[PDB]
Nucleic acid binder design. Structure first.
Length: 155
RNA sequence: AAUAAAAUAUUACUUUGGAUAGUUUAGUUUCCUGGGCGAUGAAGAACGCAAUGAAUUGCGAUAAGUGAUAGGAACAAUAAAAUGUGAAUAUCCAAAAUUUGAAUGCUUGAAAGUAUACUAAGGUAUAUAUGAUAUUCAAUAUCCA
């Protein structure tokens, strides 16, 4: 699976990617939307607070039946949740990209999460035995995640 | 009156999907030659056999192969051994061909078995109907001493 975009300067960027990750797309799509654009150090702090339910992930698009929370004030979204599994998966990719940046020799304190995209992946099927002799589909929703860190500079 | 979070629209890239294009060791039809099975056990079924095999292919206790005749230097995923004193490969040939199956000594269900005779174990023959010949008989059935 290729990357959605290429960095402007390959010498000052780092990349990490995960394919067919066993994590819900709709949860990880909203989590990756929250950390887009902030600094790597800030993003790691934000993702860690989400795990222990101290900062919200606003479910802006997929908000059907999602309950309201007190931390969703100011985000123009009345709904949010604390996806632990999806936050953990991104935390492992953010760490992996950072080690790639360090090998390149970049300055970790200057890196930001410039590009982060989530794509749908192939589903896996399972049986759900319903009434009157029926069987349904019990399908997973995996996803691919791509992460690109670039240094922030004045323009 | 204001927001663009959601929503909507266009393009580029990526993704799920497998359309489209290119292609064919596969099919369909017609035509030519034959139309060559079996008690000398067929077609079919079952089991087994490779140095590493489950299927498939080939084969039958001589097992992915034996002899003979052609054939001329390979096979390979990995080792071995053999090999111009003959490796692969080919066959209307020779030997060999497990349990069954018309199945045919008797039985057979998913049944393991078992009788007699001939030459302990092994191997042969013994089902039903039927033609010819040989031999042994039955019936005063017709004569007949």
């Amino acid at each position: 699976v290729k990357y959605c975009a290429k960095p402007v300067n390959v010498a000052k960027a780092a990349q990490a990617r995960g394919d067919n990750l066993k994590v819900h797309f709709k949860n990880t799509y909203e989590t990756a939307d929250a950390i887009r654009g902030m600094k790597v150090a800030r993003a790691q702090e934000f993702l860690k607070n989400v795990i222990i339910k101290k900062e919200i992930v606003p479910f802006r698009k997929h908000n059907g039946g999602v309950g309201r929370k007190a931390q969703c004030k100011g985000l123009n979204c009345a709904f949010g949740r604390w996806p632990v599994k999806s936050a953990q998966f991104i935390l492992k990719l953010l760490k992996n990209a950072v080690d790639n940046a360090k090998a390149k020799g970049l300055n970790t304190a200057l890196l930001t999460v410039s590009h982060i995209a989530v794509q749908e992946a192939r589903s896996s099927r399972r049986r759900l035995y319903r009434a009157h002799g029926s069987i349904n589909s019990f399908s997973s929703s995996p996803c691919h995640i791509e992460l690109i860190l670039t240094e922030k500079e004045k323009k």
